[PDB]
């Protein structure tokens, strides 16, 4: 399937400009590295109006600027031959949605400061090798798929493996594959079985369940090996990952009332508009969670508009409930 891009334009802190998701295929026009989300979509951050050209857009869309559970994920992005201008294979790792490892020039490269300083150069040399074997193995699985779906040309193959440690200490793990951005194969480590929603995917399911020693191995890695890696990195990034920075709330009007919150970490946050003094469920925009560029984050909530009514902005970060009074007669 193809997903039309969502666009938002905003500044790093109130007066750097950010053009910031949810799109597929990866074809899109400083710029950050290509990133992947849990739903197989991609997201980019371009920082200094904004023009975005995509396959789901006939005319290019224009937007102007006018004013605690921890996880470890690993993504693979495959691109059927030829290159189409994009690297055919890209693998990227994430802990708490923080970029760490980045392979495409075939090198094992860190994306964080605490990643490289805590790891000896032998570590990167060993995994840059693994990745080359993984790149080639991914290409072969791609060709095999195109022959199974009986079509050629541009197609994307995606892999996501990861685990997460709950605040209480409970753990889960997952392995999923996606063809052209749609869920393809889903692995359940409890029953050691693959789930297929497609007649074509069912073929690979019968091949992948035919190998028990692979299935048994995948259970171990998620449950045991992954978590150990997770906790190793957390101790490494104890500085940046365990910090808490408070949001700075700004309110504005243009009818519509805007509520901005700048530079807060962790990304877990809740914002809603209030009227005497209840939360308004109507004529409201979510805004989502956006990257600031500092490693911090910012979001926004708007409401379109009797007399003497009090409109105020509720924000809970550290909880720590914050309220700002925006408007009244």
């Amino acid at each position: 399937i193809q997903r039309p891009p969502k666009i938002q334009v905003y500044s790093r802190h109130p007066p750097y400009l950010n053009c910031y998701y949810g799109f597929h295929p990866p074809q899109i026009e400083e710029q950050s590295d290509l990133s992947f989300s849990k739903d197989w979509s991609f997201y980019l951050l371009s920082h200094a109006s904004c023009r975005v050209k995509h396959v789901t857009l006939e005319q290019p869309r224009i937007v102007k600027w006018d004013r605690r559970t921890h996880s470890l994920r690993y993504f693979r992005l495959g691109i059927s031959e030829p290159g189409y201008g994009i690297p055919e294979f890209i693998s990227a790792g994430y802990v708490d949605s923080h970029p760490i490892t980045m392979y495409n020039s075939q090198l094992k490269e860190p994306r964080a400061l605490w990643m490289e300083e805590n790891l000896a150069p032998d570590h990167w040399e060993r995994y840059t090798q693994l990745l080359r074997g993984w790149q080639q193995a991914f290409k072969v699985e791609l060709k095999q798929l195109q022959h199974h779906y009986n079509h050629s040309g541009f197609h994307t193959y995606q892999r996501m493996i990861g685990c997460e440690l709950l605040e209480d200490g409970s753990i889960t793990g997952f392995l999923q594959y996606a063809y052209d951005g749609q869920d393809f194969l889903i692995f359940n480590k409890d029953t050691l079985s693959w789930m297929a929603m497609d007649n074509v995917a069912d073929i690979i399911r019968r091949v992948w369940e035919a190998n028990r020693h692979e299935l048994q191995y995948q259970k171990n890695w998620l449950e045991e090996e992954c978590i150990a890696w997770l906790k190793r990195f957390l101790e490494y990034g104890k500085d940046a990952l365990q910090r808490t920075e408070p949001p700075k709330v700004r309110v504005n009007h243009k009818t519509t009332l805007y509520c901005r919150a700048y530079g807060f970490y962790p990304p877990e946050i809740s914002i809603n508009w209030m009227k005497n003094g209840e939360e308004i469920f109507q004529d409201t925009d979510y805004g989502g969670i956006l990257p600031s560029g500092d490693g911090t984050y910012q979001t926004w909530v708007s409401v379109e508009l009797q007399n003497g009514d009090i409109y105020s902005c509720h924000v809970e970060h550290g909880g720590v409930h914050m309220v700002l009074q925006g408007f009244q007669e």
């Epitope: 693994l130 074997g133 993984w134 193995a137 692979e214 191995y217």
Partner: antibody, heavy 107, light 112 residues
Framework: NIDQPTEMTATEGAIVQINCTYQ??????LFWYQQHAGEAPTFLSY??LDGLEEKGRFSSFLSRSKGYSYLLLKELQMKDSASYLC??????????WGAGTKLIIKP | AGVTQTPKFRVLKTGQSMTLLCAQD?????MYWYRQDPGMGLRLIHY???????AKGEVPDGYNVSRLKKQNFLLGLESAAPSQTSVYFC?????????????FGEGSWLTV
């Protein structure tokens, strides 16, 4: 580091057990290999989860916590006389080979 | 199919340059070369992840390695030493993302 007996000796038709103790950084699996005298090593068993694995007369057990694994050979024949190599799969995917247990089958 | 390793025997005077072939009909990425000695487990001289790319293994002073095709993996020692007497094994397998068994070559005996 990895440790297994240097040599063992049993009579044909009996049942033998070869122990293997290993300490590695992580654990990605454990392989048992059979290498006859003056020949190439061949695959026997592979274990990851804690438990047993039976294939024919041969059976393999593994305990991840203890770092222990034994290889259970039942109904020993004369062709069973060889070296049995234990090697686990580490954390990074390098493979660490220990010097096998040489089994000598008496008729 | 299988993995083929030539030769199986060789006698060398010290200082001789000689090469050892290894070939897979099996269509794998990975290729290994090993050196087995008495009382010691296998020791990896060099490994090749994919065609054209190789890397130093556990013990490789004497040995320089190249990868022609996906099918061929060459070993070489340009200057022979008495300490290089051993029983070499070539070996090709799928990547260790597992459990992926490793397939072994019939071996090469060497003295010196």
């Amino acid at each position: 580091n990895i440790d297994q007996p240097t040599e063992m000796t049993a009579t044909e038709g009996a049942i033998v057990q070869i122990n293997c103790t290993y300490q590695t950084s992580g654990f990605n699996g454990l392989f048992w290999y059979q290498q006859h005298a003056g020949e190439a090593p061949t695959f026997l068993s592979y274990n990851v989860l804690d438990g047993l694995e039976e294939k024919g007369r041969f059976s393999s057990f593994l305990s991840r916590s203890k770092g222990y694994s034994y290889l259970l050979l039942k109904e020993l024949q004369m062709k069973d006389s060889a070296s049995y190599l234990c090697a686990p799969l580490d954390s990074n995917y390098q493979l660490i080979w220990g010097a096998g247990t040489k089994l000598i089958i008496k008729p | 199919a299988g993995v083929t390793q030539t030769p199986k025997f060789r006698v060398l005077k010290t200082g001789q340059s000689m090469t050892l072939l290894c070939a897979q009909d099996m269509n794998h990425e990975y290729m290994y070369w090993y050196r087995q000695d008495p009382g010691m487990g296998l020791r990896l001289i060099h490994y090749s992840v994919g065609e054209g790319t190789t890397a130093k293994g556990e013990v490789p002073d004497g040995y320089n390695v190249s990868r022609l095709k996906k099918q061929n993996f060459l070993l070489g020692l340009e200057s022979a030493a008495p300490s290089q007497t051993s029983v070499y094994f070539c070996a090709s397998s799928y990547p260790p993302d597992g459990g992926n068994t490793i397939y072994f070559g019939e071996g090469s005996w060497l003295t010196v």
